[PDB]
Design a binder for this molecule. Sequence first.
Ligand SMILES: [Zn+2]
Lengths: 165, 180
Amino acid sequence: FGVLAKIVNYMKTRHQRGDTHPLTLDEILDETQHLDIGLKQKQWLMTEALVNNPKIEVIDGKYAFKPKYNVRDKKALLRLLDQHDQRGLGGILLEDIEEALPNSQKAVKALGDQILFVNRPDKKKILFFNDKSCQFSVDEEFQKLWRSVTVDSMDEEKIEEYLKR
Amino acid sequence: PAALKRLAKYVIRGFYGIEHALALDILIRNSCVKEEDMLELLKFDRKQLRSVLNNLKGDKFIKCRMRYFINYRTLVNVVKYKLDHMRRRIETDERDSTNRASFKCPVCSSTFTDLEANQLFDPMTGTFRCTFCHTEVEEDESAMPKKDARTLLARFNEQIEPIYALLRETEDVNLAYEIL
Ligand SMILES: [Zn+2]
């Protein structure tokens, strides 16, 4: 059990490093020098666990798309970040970092294109989204907007209508 | 209502923050999504997103359907209600709040008007003496514009008005659109 969890963590790390190549359980045992895990355990890991794990795709006799549902491409998913009107819907700071390289350099670049960062979940988590229209008047930003609205309360709007007539 | 969709895209940019703008935008497409689903889709914090949703609901940006499952959807008034209110905000501003009649006592920094000048006179000096701390008074400019600045905002309002003309036309089209 533990061995498999160590395999998964290794597999994430190896994907981060760049080695997205398809491989087999036998190859991972070898490279980690843990072939002596026993044929019974080896098989159970292979033909029960790593088939019920939705993170890997089985192709012919080998495992693909390695650590999870991913598309990889050099973490330069510019079109994906674009994604027309859908606009990604929303990217995660954690996934881009896991993807290949640290986010910060890419984010800094992304901050000067069309992307915005919000501190979602626990101020520590960050999401990226796509803005568009600029703000319309250079006021001190916030004092005029606070003064500008229609009263939260009923019949106010009706007093504005009555004043117009 | 593609025009209204864009007029709304204007309104989100001008008004609140991008989180609010994002929440309004997903809703503009006639969203009737479950709050939990709207949470997963948006990936915000549940309590805080709800705070966003309550802030938007109370000013009257949102309408609900009690499905006891809670459902949110954009209120069916088509901004104009918001814009009309905002116009009044601008319309209030536009009006001059500065009095063209104005002395003040330098010591107590109090303010006085033309109405008090006929009583704040002193004949032994031929000029004005304050009520509780007799000193000469000269002009005011207290809590008021000295030069340009309220006027610059009025000019700003003037600058806003052409770039809002097309939007007023967007409203015109929308207002004819109330046959359709
Ligand atoms: Zn005085």
